């Protein structure tokens, strides 16, 4: 799915993407590098680049977090003003403040959940969740 995530985030022009229960794979596409990212994390395991990697063990059960809430509810969870959100449903709150991300979106797809995010204001536009699937 590494290619199918790279083709997705680069075209929609968001900064990162995560497929998810533990990680699946991810793709960075903001302002070689994704690869640079996995190598280091696995190396250390005994601004946005921080965000992306620190996710790697942000693993939630059914209902917990944004992935778990999208999987068990079966619906996308679009999230605005990520740099002031609350931790009741958006578990990596203080981690998103770090890099001035505004929106984070997570939705069920392909028997898992796909997450997408950017550092700009995007009014809830659900045809771009149709773009990730069609383009894949």
């Amino acid at each position: 799915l590494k290619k199918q995530l790279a083709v997705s985030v680069r075209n929609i022009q968001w900064s990162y993407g995560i497929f998810w229960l533990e990680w699946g794979d991810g793709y960075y596409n903001g302002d070689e590098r994704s690869e640079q990212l996995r190598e280091l994390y696995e190396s250390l395991s005994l601004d946005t680049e921080w965000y992306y990697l620190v996710c790697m063990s942000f693993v939630f059960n059914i209902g917990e977090g944004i992935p778990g809430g999208a999987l068990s509810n079966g619906e996308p969870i679009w999230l605005c003003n990520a740099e002031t959100a609350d931790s009741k449903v958006f578990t990596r709150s203080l981690l998103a403040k770090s890099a001035s991300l505004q929106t984070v979106v997570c939705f069920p797809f392909l028997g898992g959940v796909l997450e997408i995010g950017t550092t700009e204001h995007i009014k809830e536009d659900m045809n771009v969740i149709q773009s990730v699937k069609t383009l894949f």
Partner: peptide
């Protein structure tokens, strides 16, 4: 505060 020590735990793990 439950939020911030999530990050300290992993940041210490790396």
């Amino acid at each position: 505060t439950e939020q911030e020590e999530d990050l300290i735990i992993r940041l210490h793990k790396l």
